Design a protein around this ligand. Structure first.
Ligand SMILES: *Cc1ccc([N+](=O)[O-])c(OC(=O)c2ccc(C(F)(F)F)nc2C)c1
Ligand SMILES: *Cc1ccc([N+](=O)[O-])c(OC(=O)c2ccc(C(F)(F)F)nc2C)c1
Ligand SMILES: [Ca+2]
Ligand SMILES: [Ca+2]
Ligand SMILES: [Cl-]
Ligand SMILES: [Cl-]
Ligand SMILES: [Cl-]
Ligand SMILES: [Cl-]
Lengths: 228, 9, 228, 9
């Protein structure tokens, strides 16, 4: 529906939609921007991520409320409505994964773009895994793991240990291990090793980069406090 | 546990 | 789209959507329930009101953000996007007004249902007036005033001065006077008279009704503090 | 000024 609007206008309206907290609009604008076919800048990648993170975040919150009501009940209404929200969530995840596959990832050659998209791919397979129950839950989990793992491999070779994208990737991969893969020990070990190697690299950073990295290290520490 | 909040900017 | 779902299922799903904070769903479910043609109960009227109040409330918040950015700028993007949100808001208001006109109001014979719907009619014309700028802004304002006035007339004849619907009607009509009609003195006089007559009737109420009424009287007092 | 919040229950 965005084929007739300029790429630059879609980006400008995505920024406006974020200010207005209209995240469904924001996501549609950035989907249109991706479909122009050009690669995305650092700023533009973050707009894409923020838009869909908010959209799927509201759907995940609603799914958990409805799933909890459904488990307490065990008419068809609660199950039917949970299924509807679940189907809508899966469609959003499939849309994001389709954008990454057509063709953001294959054209991403720099470490910072490629790791960013692969982390995204792991995240949205993780969201699919949160609601998966059938014969494909194992394959969805492995799809998330494989995307995170490739991102991890690149980030360890190409980024410093304090790089915020590398830190956020490890944070979310650790959450994957703890919440999805039933591997809490792997989750704790990744979070600790990530935190400790970042701590040793902080001396290299400017005041602004120091603030960026320590913010995410605090999230790693928050999870370790909860997990140990 | 918290993933990256990721909802601003 | 709700023609094939049972009235009772629509109501139950509206309650589920409120718990999940899915207010667009909630509004669609209650629109379907209204279109079954039966009158609405007290509880059902409040579900209808809460659903659309949340939907239009997000649109009004977004419109104000975009309108403020647009005024600061004075490309076409900000104006275009504000117009889009404005058009979407007007469609929601028109939908609510259409439900009241077909046929909630004409079948509402009790004071508590009739005042409730007429207050609703005044509110959604007020929301239309907030964004109106053309040759119909005066007619929209008069439509809001006329609906509020008929509701006021019924509530004064048929309800005690502490009735929460009567109090909330007077509160919103006072906001209409202050924010829309450029009549701050009428706004202050209505709020004061409403508060004072409710205060004198509180001695008649149970503990639970006392809490209901004093909550809304506090909102009247909050506005008077801001206006004087 | 505040109208009836009207967004809960
Ligand atoms: C995957 C990932 C890695 C790092 C970061 N990060 O915060 O640096 C994020 O999250 C964001 O997109 C982000 C960045 C900065 C802010 C700010 F408000 F603190 F400026 N917020 C967010 C949501 C993700
Ligand atoms: C027009 C109107 C009149 C009265 C009231 N009221 O609060 O009584 C309302 O608003 C509501 O619909 C309402 C009622 C009660 C609560 C509660 F959370 F405090 F229980 N919230 C709301 C939003 C409108
Ligand atoms: Ca172009
Ligand atoms: Ca029936
Ligand atoms: Cl449903
Ligand atoms: Cl490239
Ligand atoms: Cl637009
Ligand atoms: Cl009737």
């Amino acid at each position: 529906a965005m084929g007739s609007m300029e790429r630059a206008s879609l980006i400008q309206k995505a920024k406006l939609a974020e200010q207005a907290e209209r995240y469904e609009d924001m996501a549609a604008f950035m989907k249109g921007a991706v479909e122009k076919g050009e690669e995305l800048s650092c700023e533009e990648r973050n707009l894409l991520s923020v838009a869909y993170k908010n959209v799927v975040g509201g759907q995940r919150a609603a799914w958990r409320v409805l799933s909890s009501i459904e488990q307490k009940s065990n008419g068809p209404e609660v199950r039917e409505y949970r299924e509807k929200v679940e189907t809508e969530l899966q469609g959003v995840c499939d849309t994001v994964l389709g954008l990454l596959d057509s063709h953001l990832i294959k054209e991403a050659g720099d470490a910072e773009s490629r790791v960013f998209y692969l982390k995204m791919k792991g995240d949205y397979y993780r969201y699919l895994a949160e609601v998966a129950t059938g014969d494909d839950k194992k394959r969805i989990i492995d799809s998330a793991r494989s995307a995170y793992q490739e991102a991890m491999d690149i980030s360890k070779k190409e980024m410093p240990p304090t790089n915020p994208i590398r830190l956020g990737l490890a944070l979310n991969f650790s959450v994957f291990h703890y919440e999805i893969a039933n591997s809490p020990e792997e989750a704790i070990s990744l979070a600790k090793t990530t935190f400790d190697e970042a701590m040793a690299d902080l001396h290299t950073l400017s005041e602004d980069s120091y603030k960026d990295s320590t913010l995410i290290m605090q999230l790693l520490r928050d999870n370790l406090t909860l997990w140990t | 546990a918290g993933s990256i909040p990721g909802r601003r900017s």
